[PDB]
Write an enzyme that holds these catalytic residues in place. Structure first.
Site, PDB file in Angstrom:
ATOM      1  N   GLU A 132      49.406  14.634  31.342  1.00 19.06           N
ATOM      2  CA  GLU A 132      48.806  13.535  30.587  1.00 19.06           C
ATOM      3  C   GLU A 132      48.615  12.365  31.544  1.00 19.06           C
ATOM      4  O   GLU A 132      49.587  11.700  31.912  1.00 19.06           O
ATOM      5  CB  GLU A 132      49.679  13.142  29.397  1.00 19.06           C
ATOM      6  N   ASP A 165      42.252   8.621  22.074  1.00 15.65           N
ATOM      7  CA  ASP A 165      42.665   9.959  22.477  1.00 15.65           C
ATOM      8  C   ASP A 165      41.645  10.980  21.969  1.00 15.65           C
ATOM      9  O   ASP A 165      40.543  10.634  21.532  1.00 15.65           O
ATOM     10  CB  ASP A 165      44.073  10.239  21.957  1.00 15.65           C
ATOM     11  CG  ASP A 165      44.845  11.199  22.838  1.00 15.65           C
ATOM     12  OD1 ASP A 165      44.208  12.034  23.514  1.00 15.65           O
ATOM     13  OD2 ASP A 165      46.092  11.120  22.847  1.00 15.65           O
ATOM     14  N   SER A 180      59.935  32.360  20.666  1.00 12.15           N
ATOM     15  CA  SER A 180      60.009  31.991  22.077  1.00 12.15           C
ATOM     16  C   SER A 180      61.260  31.179  22.383  1.00 12.15           C
ATOM     17  O   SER A 180      61.827  31.310  23.475  1.00 12.15           O
ATOM     18  CB  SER A 180      58.758  31.215  22.487  1.00 12.15           C
ATOM     19  OG  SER A 180      57.591  31.999  22.309  1.00 12.15           O
TER      20      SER A 180
END
Ligand SMILES: C[N+]1(C)[C@@H]2C[C@@H](OC(=O)C(O)(c3cccs3)c3cccs3)C[C@H]1[C@@H]1O[C@@H]12
Ligand SMILES: CCCCCCCC/C=C/CCCCCCCC(=O)OC[C@H](O)CO
Ligand SMILES: CCCCCCCC/C=C\CCCCCCCC(=O)O
Ligand SMILES: CCCCCCCC/C=C\CCCCCCCC(=O)O
Length: 416
Positions: free
Chosen positions: A209, A218, A289
């Site tokens: 970023e 944004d 995950s």
């Protein structure tokens, strides 16, 4: 005087040959090494074209003009040489400006700029540089005599009509050299400020970023600023507060606390990166995950994370984060950091070459503005030729600050 003419002719012939050979080496290197065919180097190729024009035509015509003591080629030839000269050099200035902005926006805007950099965009910027230089300088030099009605250039001299007045020359120096040099210096200072720190969490989230000094909209349209936060230069404390809040939110999450407590510092940094991108809820959605990462199954978790919407939305950022989880190293971000540092060193070399070679002429312009023809013609000639020397030194810049250019040059010279 004859000894002087021979010496000047020999030195300038040598300098012109060095310029030609260097920029031809740049072009041949770009052609025969596919590793050099990057978006950054198309601008360098544009520079090499301007510098080759300077080395073949500009240097030889200028030295014949000063050695003969007059212009003996006709007014149209004088105007064509001056037009070629000023258009190519203004093109070099514009190319340096677009290189500066390209590097800066690559550092500070990863999604809106850096992920969109293609050779065609670079070619648009290059062609605009050349076209604007042409349409500004060729009509002026070629038709100011027609604009005023009369041609007030002496028959034996070759100078631009309107640049005799000190105020017009001063305005031209301001708008054409001093403001571009200020802009490039500010942009390079920002690029350099982002190349001093070692590989850490700040540099990781800056790569992913970019850092913006002004409030912007944004991708979703909300008012974000800095490193994805919703106008100053010290956003480091703001970044620390955001990562502090991120750690405090992860530690207060049922699905994120055991995995965060079990992971390495680098992998905790990757988890904080994912929280920065999506949030605590988004990262909490990766229950499979997270359980794979908590059980130290790095390859399984990597291949499981590569099958998500997160991997398809942003391929590069997800690949870096997944490599960090899979290896537990900074290497995925170390590579980008050393690439950016090398780009910055190359930029600094070409900027310094430009500024050093062109500063005496424009200082002379400033002094001539604040006096009455006090700068002798000998100094004007020396400053003009010194600005030419930029085109000679630029390939040596490429050879001294780019190991790929240096290797390709050594391969071509030794004929390997
Ligand atoms: C050696 N040059 C070939 C000529 C003289 C120098 O000129 C400069 O440094 C100037 O700032 C100026 C000349 C006159 C007033 S301000 C520029 C002109 C165009 C772009 S920047 C550098 C280059 C440029 O082609 C002119
Ligand atoms: C004298 C006034 C001239 C006025 C302007 C007319 C000329 C403009 C030409 C621009 C070419 C720049 C586009 C090419 C730059 C890179 C784009 C590209 O993809 O090039 C791929 C190829 O490998 C590269 O040879
Ligand atoms: C950043 C680079 C800035 C370049 C500055 C260019 C300087 C322009 C100076 C004089 C141009 C004046 C207008 C020329 C009109 C063209 C036709 C004519 O000469 O009548
Ligand atoms: C004699 C004049 C040559 C001036 C050389 C200027 C060198 C610029 C700095 C550099 O090498 O990048």
């Amino acid at each position: 005087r004859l000894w002087e003419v021979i010496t000047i002719a020999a030195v300038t012939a040598v300098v012109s040959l060095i310029t030609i050979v260097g920029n031809v080496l740049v072009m041949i290197s770009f052609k025969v090494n596919s590793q050099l065919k990057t978006v950054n180097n198309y601008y360098l190729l544009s520079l090499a074209c301007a510098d080759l024009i300077i080395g073949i035509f500009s240097m030889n015509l200028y030295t014949t003009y000063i050695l003969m003591g007059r212009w003996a080629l006709g007014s149209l030839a004088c105007d064509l040489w001056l037009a070629l000269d000023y258009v190519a050099s203004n093109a070099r200035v514009m190319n340096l400006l677009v290189i500066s902005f390209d590097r800066y926006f690559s550092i500070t805007r990863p999604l809106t700029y850096r992920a969109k950099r293609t050779p065609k965009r670079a070619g648009i910027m290059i062609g605009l540089a050349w076209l604007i230089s042409f349409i500004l300088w060729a009509p002026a030099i070629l038709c100011w005599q027609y604009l005023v009605g009369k041609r007030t250039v002496p028959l034996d001299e070759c100078q631009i009509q309107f640049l005799s007045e000190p105020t017009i020359t001063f305005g031209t120096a301001i708008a054409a050299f001093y403001i571009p040099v200020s802009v490039m210096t500010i942009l390079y200072c920002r690029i350099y400020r982002e190349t001093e720190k070692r590989t850490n969490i700040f540099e990781m989230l800056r790569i992913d970023e970019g850092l913006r000094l002004k409030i912007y909209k944004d991708t979703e349209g909300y008012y974000t600023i800095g490193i994805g936060h919703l106008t100053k230069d010290e956003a480091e404390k703001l970044f620390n507060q955001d990562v502090d809040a991120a750690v405090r939110g992860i530690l207060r999450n049922a699905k994120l606390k055991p995995v965060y407590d079990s992971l390495d510092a680098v992998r905790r940094a990757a988890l904080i990166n994912m929280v920065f991108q999506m949030g605590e809820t988004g990262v909490a959605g990766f229950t499979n995950s997270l359980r794979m990462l908590q059980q130290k199954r790095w390859d399984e978790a990597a291949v499981n994370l590569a099958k998500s919407r997160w991997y398809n939305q942003t391929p590069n950022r997800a690949k870096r984060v997944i490599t960090t989880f899979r290896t537990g190293t900074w290497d995925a971000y170390r590579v980008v950091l050393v690439k950016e540092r090398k780009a910055a060193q190359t930029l600094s070399a070409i900027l310094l070459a430009f500024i050093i070679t062109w500063t005496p002429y424009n200082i002379m312009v400033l002094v001539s503005t604040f006096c009455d023809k006090c700068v002798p013609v000998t100094l004007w000639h020396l400053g003009y030729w010194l600005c030419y020397v930029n085109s000679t030194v630029n390939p040596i810049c490429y050879a001294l600050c780019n190991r790929t250019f240096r290797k390709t040059f050594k391969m071509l010279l030794l004929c390997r």
